């Protein structure tokens, strides 16, 4: 039979059968209970709208993501999300399909063990396998080397790989991602008068960020230009009218990636953690990693980031090496495409964690040889 | 049929059919297992890359030479190296070709006996013969007398020969060679800030030594000059950028040959063990040995060694004798060229150790008349 390539993610759940080009169903991972009282009788009001249904009734819900930073903080809601994904968005019972979840690097063990225990006890799948979210993004590019920066919505991690041999001592995981950029944008919009507070209006700020923000090639020059002319002010129409005008908030929101001091984080930007991740590698594979830097994940879709990052790394790196940044147009679904490719391989067909194996060793089987 | 003139060496395996000018395939003798985990499935990852293949994937391997000082310390790896040499670099099955290995003087017997046992049982050659690495280097020079200093990469030995009669009591074998010079260079580079530790970076230090180091004609004057001017500082680009500048480390690394007290060895340099080897000979053949001093082996390729050695010996020797140092441009492959010449001789065709002879007397046949 065919395998189910699910990809929990944090912000958008992407799923679909193995062997295709794009995920079949992509929908936000939010579960929102209603918060008001409700007076109409017999309206058929449910107790929790999940997935894309709660992005249409969000006016009277309190949306809450079940995955904070890679890790899962609310297991009941995550179980509800998985149940919805299997039964309503794909309509395939899990009793007859292997599953291939994905997990960020350096995550707590208990999260992974609970994930496999749920998949084997509640949904009762035949066999499931957990894979690191960066190796798949490297599969999708058709490479076999390269250092991949997978800046998702929950957590940004940077896994270097050479000739198929991952370097476990050079993984640099940073917890700045799309959600923190949304919060920072929502916080700097208040400088013009627009106040978004409700958890429903966070979605509106996210839409503003997606449609308007861009990464500046040079930050100081843009700050000077936006403060003199008015060629940058782009307007946007809220879900009820009252258009708003975003000035130099456009390139200040995604600039947080390269200067995490804006949101008070100490660490260095995504332009310098990649160079540090390279320098921890051996001295003989640094040229190949320099030449095959891969971008993935949703948050790396800002217009103009593949040039800013290249300029920064070229500034840091030695002058002789060639710096090349692979930015495929299908960046958002790169991890899932790689997952489909991996699940479609014949050599991989014996790596699944078969159910009888789980019955013999318990949930701690995932840390064992079947990784 | 044609004979296979293999030459194990220590650092570079040189092989080729008898009767040519240069070895057909020359490649480092290193076998490196991968050390990281490996996440890509179906990449076709082997368990051990040998020869020149492991000098390209050395970023994720742990290279380890199977020959320490002439002697062989890891027989399985040496067998693997031989198998590679026969089947992939020459593509001739050994069942139809005599072989002519080479061995340093004064080596343990068990090494030679195991070598012949392997060649007769595993590879199943028709007949093999083991020859001393210095007599061949004397063949290649077209001489018949002379004292040859064969400073390889494993061990430096100094065999005097007169009129074809070797003098077994005057062989002076010293264990300082190219590998110790590589280690000492890697140890003195730390005085400027460059730290090379990994077994892969030993190859980079070896490349630095080959391309930059030279032997000073007079040591104290060079030490004084390099400490005042800056006309010696030559720069070199690592495999990833970050050029380095070598100062007076240039002529201090190969100076260890003439002052083995630098690496803590007690013995005298290669300039004085040759004179001692001569003085052990009879009083009537010392003039001929003085006039026909032969250099061979890789490590004697330093720019300016044929003058330093001549100056030193002229200082030691009596003033009347003429000191001449033969330094052919084809120094590195001198032993193999001599091996080809010896294997191509008609008079030598009945000295091979035929397989039926080995079957009758066991591996201890090599010490017998068929030397």
């Amino acid at each position: 039979t065919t395998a189910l390539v699910c990809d929990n993610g944090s912000g958008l759940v992407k799923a679909g059968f193995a062997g295709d080009d794009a995920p079949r169903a992509v929908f936000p991972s939010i579960v929102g209970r209603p918060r008001h009282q409700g007076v109409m009788v017999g309206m058929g009001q449910k107790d929790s709208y999940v997935g894309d249904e709660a992005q249409s009734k969000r006016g009277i819900l309190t949306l809450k993501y079940p995955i904070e930073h890679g890790i899962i903080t609310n297991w009941d809601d995550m179980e509800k999300i998985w149940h919805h994904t299997f039964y309503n968005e794909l309509r395939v019972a899990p009793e007859e399909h292997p599953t291939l979840l994905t997990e960020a690097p350096l995550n707590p063990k208990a999260n992974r063990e609970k994930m496999t225990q749920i998949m084997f006890e509640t949904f009762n799948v035949p066999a499931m396998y957990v894979a690191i979210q960066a190796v798949l993004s490297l599969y999708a590019s058709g490479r076999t080397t390269g250092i991949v920066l997978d800046s998702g919505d929950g957590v940004t991690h940077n896994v270097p790989i050479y000739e198929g041999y991952a370097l476990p001592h050079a993984i640099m995981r940073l917890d700045l991602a799309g959600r923190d950029l949304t919060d920072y944008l929502m916080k700097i919009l208040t400088e013009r008068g627009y106040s978004f507070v409700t958890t429903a209006e966070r979605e509106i700020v996210r839409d503003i960020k997606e449609k308007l923000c861009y990464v500046a090639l040079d930050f100081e020059n843009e700050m000077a230009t936006a403060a003199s002319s008015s060629s940058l002010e782009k307007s946007y129409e809220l879900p009820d009218g009252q258009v708003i005008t975003i000035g130099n908030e456009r390139f200040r929101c995604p600039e947080t990636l390269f200067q995490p001091s804006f949101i008070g984080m100490e660490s260095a930007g995504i332009h310098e953690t990649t160079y540090n991740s390279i320098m921890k590698c051996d001295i003989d594979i640094r040229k190949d990693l320099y030449a095959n830097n891969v971008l993935s994940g949703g948050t790396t879709m800002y217009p103009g980031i593949a040039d800013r990052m290249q300029k920064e790394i070229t500034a840091l790196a030695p002058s002789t090496m060639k710096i090349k940044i692979i930015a495929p147009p299908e960046r958002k679904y790169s991890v899932w495409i790689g997952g489909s490719i991996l699940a479609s391989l014949s050599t991989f067909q014996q790596m699944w964690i078969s159910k009888q194996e789980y019955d013999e060793a318990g949930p701690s089987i995932v840390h064992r040889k079947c990784f | 049929t044609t004979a296979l003139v293999c030459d194990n060496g220590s650092g570079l395996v040189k092989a080729g059919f008898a009767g040519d000018d240069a070895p057909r395939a020359v490649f480092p003798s290193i076998v490196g297992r991968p050390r990281h985990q490996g996440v890509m499935v179906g990449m076709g990852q082997k368990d051990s890359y040998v020869g020149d293949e492991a000098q390209s994937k050395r970023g994720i391997l742990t290279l380890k030479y199977p020959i320490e000082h002439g002697i062989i310390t890891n027989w399985d790896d040496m067998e693997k190296i031989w198998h590679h040499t026969f089947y992939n670099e020459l593509r001739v099955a050994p069942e139809e070709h005599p072989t002519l290995l080479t061995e340093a003087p004064l080596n343990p017997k068990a090494n030679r006996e195991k070598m012949t046992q392997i060649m007769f049982e595993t590879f199943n050659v028709p007949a093999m013969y083991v020859a001393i690495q210095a007599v061949l280097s004397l063949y290649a020079s077209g001489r018949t007398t002379g004292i040859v200093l064969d400073s390889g990469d494993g061990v430096t030995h100094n065999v005097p020969i007169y009129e074809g009669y070797a003098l077994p009591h005057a062989i002076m074998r010293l264990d300082l060679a190219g590998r110790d010079l590589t280690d000492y260079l890697m140890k003195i580079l730390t005085e400027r800030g460059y730290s090379f530790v990994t077994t892969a970076e030993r190859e980079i230090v070896r490349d630095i030594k080959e391309k930059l180091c030279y032997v000073a004609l007079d040591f104290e004057n060079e030490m004084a000059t390099a400490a005042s001017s800056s006309s010696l500082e030559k720069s070199y680009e690592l495999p990833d950028g970050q050029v380095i500048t070598i100062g007076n480390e240039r002529f201090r690394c190969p100076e260890t040959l003439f002052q083995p007290s630098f690496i803590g060895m007690e013995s005298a340099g290669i300039h004085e063990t040759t004179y001692n080897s001569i003085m052990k000979c009879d009083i009537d053949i010392r003039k001929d040995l003085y006039a026909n001093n032969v250099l061979s082996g890789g490590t004697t390729m330093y720019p300016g060694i044929a003058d330093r050695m001549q100056k030193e010996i002229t200082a030691l020797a009596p003033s009347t004798m003429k000191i001449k140092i033969i330094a052919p441009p084809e120094r590195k492959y001198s032993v193999w060229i001599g091996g080809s010449i010896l294997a191509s001789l008609s008079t030598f065709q009945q000295m091979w150790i035929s397989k039926q002879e080995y079957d009758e007397a066991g591996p201890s046949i090599v010490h017998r008349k068929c030397f």
């Binding site: 058709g142 014996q350 040889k369 079947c370 990784f371 | 490996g38 890509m40 179906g42 076709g44 990852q45």
Partner: peptide, 20 residues
């Protein structure tokens, strides 16, 4: 110990043509 992937045959970077 870290997992050990069994050795296969082929391929990679050859499906980029057939999917692009």
């Amino acid at each position: 110990v870290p997992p050990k992937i069994p050795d296969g045959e082929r391929v990679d970077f050859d499906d980029i043509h057939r999917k692009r």
